[PDB]
Amino acid sequence: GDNLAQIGVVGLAVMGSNLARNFARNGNTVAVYNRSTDKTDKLIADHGSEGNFIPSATVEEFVASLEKPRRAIIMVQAGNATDAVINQLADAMDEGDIIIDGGNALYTDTIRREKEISARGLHFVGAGISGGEEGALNGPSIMPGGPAKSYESLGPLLESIAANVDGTPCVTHIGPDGAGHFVKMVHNGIEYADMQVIGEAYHLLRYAAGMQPAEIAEVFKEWNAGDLDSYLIEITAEVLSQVDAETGKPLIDVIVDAAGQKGTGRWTVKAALDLGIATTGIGEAVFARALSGATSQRAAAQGNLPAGVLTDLEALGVDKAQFVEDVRRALYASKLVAYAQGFDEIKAGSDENNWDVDPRDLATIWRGGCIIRAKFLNRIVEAYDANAELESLLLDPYFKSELGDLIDSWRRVIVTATQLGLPIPVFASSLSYYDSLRAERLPAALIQGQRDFFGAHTYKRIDKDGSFHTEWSGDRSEVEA
Amino acid sequence: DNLAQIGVVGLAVMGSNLARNFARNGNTVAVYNRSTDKTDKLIADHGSEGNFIPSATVEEFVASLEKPRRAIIMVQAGNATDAVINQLADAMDEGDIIIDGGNALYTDTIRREKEISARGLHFVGAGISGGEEGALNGPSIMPGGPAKSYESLGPLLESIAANVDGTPCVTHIGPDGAGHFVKMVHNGIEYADMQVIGEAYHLLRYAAGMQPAEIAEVFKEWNAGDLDSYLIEITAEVLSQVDAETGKPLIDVIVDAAGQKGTGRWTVKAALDLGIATTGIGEAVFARALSGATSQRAAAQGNLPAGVLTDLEALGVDKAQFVEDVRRALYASKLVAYAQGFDEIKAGSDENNWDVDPRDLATIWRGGCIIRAKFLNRIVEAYDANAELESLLLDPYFKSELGDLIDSWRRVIVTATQLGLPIPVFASSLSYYDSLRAERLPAALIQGQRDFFGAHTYKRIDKDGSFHTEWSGDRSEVEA
């Protein structure tokens, strides 16, 4: 009846609350539960006007106040807190019901949980939810994984709260089991890289070009008009514009430059290492966060490492404005490299786990409700639309056409930065990855040689299939392995 | 009597070679292998090398060991290793010693310690380097476990360990998984050492135009100086080898796909979760992953725009100043890799309660290991002078060297970029260096970005406490 809810949310911290309210604000009847009932009461009291909520003090009431097939969404801390609730819902649920973790869960746990829960006759969906607390309230990006029959009852509910971009719901069936939580973690990694490339551009503009932060804010606003158009560059301009009331100096000059990597960024570069994917952009970005928090080591390194002979833009004879454009092109290229790696990681996760994930879906639903939202994503959708089996976003004709006009600026940026001794982790590592991909012969041939010498590790040959070994200690003849 | 002092479980190449190491060094060695065919091949071929006491069952193997019983496990890492451990503990006496010598994950070793520690026994996780020739001819052995066990075990281990200037390349590392942890960091450092040699060889061949034969000759020249290493010495051989079938240099015929299928990745994962910037080892592992992506390489080869490129001739760069500039970029990039590697040891040591002495490692890595080089003595000296040295880069010797390395370092990154050649570790290392020097890093901006979109608080250089700016409202600042 109308006394039954279409969806329910277990765990009413700010995030679980915001998501329940979002379901209620878009005309869904929503059941809400929390072990400590005090939280439930505070939702009803302070936000009950936003729509039609059905509160329960027990798990068995919650499950009884839900229409069928029963959709419940868990929004408690990741790990053991989560498994607790999952077991409680299955004890109480009937066969054919759908259980959903919407918390930030390692995708390996999601596969374990999906096997066990499906075996118990139920249905398990792991659902990535970006946008933090704001997105959860006003429109997130939803990335759900589980049985495709479950998105049939779940899909239209999520399409009602999801961020909308040009009439299209920023949510779609990702693939089976852990695909959703996997793609959310890749998206958290591709954000560290986005924040890092912007940082690098800012650093080169402040210390090579001698631009104050208010003036750099203006340059980002103008770049936000072009191809780089993104929510992150938009807000970066707001931050650099800010002034500290107390001191009168730019707010950024009064913030301790120490940013922990205590987040998801490190899980992305780990699966990359496990799937054998060169994610140098996200890696360098995660590493750069670690280095910033080395307070004792930075204090001791300060002014104590030799710089070498350094020049400036004036002595090089470099026009400020030409250099600003060059940094913009270096930024763009480095973002492309980061994304090409991230989408490689997606394709490798998908093959390893037989997921059949469509990169087009991710590029489409990441246009709203998350921090990486940018017009840029549309060209990734188009690229895969033109060639499902594109071996790299770099090889898409549009992007390959762009690289043609980026490359010289990119090279000039790494050269100039070295000549002024300025930190450029992603810009420089992206160009090395680029020049690596385009090379006919890499120094791995010699690594194979070293390994065969010290460990009889074997090497393959260009002209003949199978493994081979040189009798290094012996006659230096070559034999089959 | 008629008892073995030490026993080896796992009679494949590592294990048979190890058992044969103990025997050749005049200990009596018990040998047992689940499948008995291997236990036979050993006695059949290498039984003449020393006194082996072979067993078909775990009971017989444990019956042949002198008390306190010492058995080394040399089998597949993972489920195969956890099984042999229970089979041993189910037959051993209180006070006996189980040693795992395989490439174990250090978190399983810490857990295996407490499981076995409980049952009255002692558990040792021992990193064994040097592959199969080192297992026979002299490995570096990095044992972690209870100190009171090294007393029984050390003298046996010192009898087979690689020996350098009369000092044995084995010593107690620290409690539980300390030994397996430093073995994993030694393997990560090995990838960086190999990658920097690659980058140099690449710039000598593609920027200077030297053929393999000539690169060999300049590598033996560098081996007389400060860079003396086993890796550079073998590199010159590899580079001199000619493939008989075609007549072209053997490395021109090798598929240039390394493959990161090793333990190099376990180092970066550990670094990532310990809050340590491992850009050298990281980029080294990344470069291996990239080399192996055949189909993406076939597709990108000749299809990505290079830009305008120059050569050394048009830059007016002298070949001889360039080859010495490359030598210094390699020396500095390797020094960055070692400093990050030793920061990971500090962190991992501090994360547990290990008190690991970095000096022991630089000392026992001088033999057995592929990374053995004269350079390690300088790391020992750096930590003798300052036990709390914040970075190897700051140790006065290393810092004095960097003074003379930095200008060549910058010219190499610059020249490589202008010739479109890939130099990942050389370039990652310089940004890390320039990061360490910077008074203000981009993390200040990142804190601002996070406070705006996630109310993720920030800190201030003047006042104390955490602060947030009402970005969506007044844009004022309110402590939280």
Residue numbers in the entry:
A (entry chain A): 4 to 484
B (entry chain B): 5 to 484
From the study:
In summary, we determined the crystal structures of the apo and complex forms of Cg6PGD with a resolution of 2.4 and 1.9 Å, respectively; Cg6PGD is the crucial enzyme in NADPH production. Cg6PGD eluted with a molecular weight of approximately 116.8 kDa, indicating that Cg6PGD exists as a dimer in solution. The monomeric structure of Cg6PGD could be divided into three functional domains : the N-terminal domain (N-term domain, Met1-Pro179), the central domain (CD, Asp180-Arg441), and the C-terminal domain (C-term domain, Ala442-Ala484). The CD consisted of α-helices exclusively and was associated with dimerization.
The crystal forms of both structures included a dimer per asymmetric unit. To characterize the conformational change between Cg6PGD_apo and Cg6PGD_NADP, we determined the crystal structures of both forms. Structural differences between Cg6PGD_apo and Cg6PGD_NADP were detected in the residual movement together with the loop. To predict the substrate-binding site of Cg6PGD, similar structures (Gs6PGD and Ec6PGD) were used to perform alignments, which revealed that the Asn107, Ser133, Gly134, Gly135, Lys187, Asn191, Glu194, Tyr195, Lys265, Thr267, Arg292, Arg454, and His460 residues were involved in the binding to substrate in Cg6PGD. In turn, the Tyr195, Lys265, Arg292 and Arg454 residues stabilized the phosphate moiety of 6PG through hydrogen bonds, and the Asn191, Glu194 and Thr267 residues also formed a water-mediated hydrogen bond with the phosphate moiety of 6PG. Docking simulations of the substrate were also performed to predict the substrate-binding mode. The 6PG molecule fitted the substrate-binding cavity well, which was predicted based on other similar structure. In the substrate-binding pocket, the N-term domain, CD, C-term domain were involved in the binding of substrate.
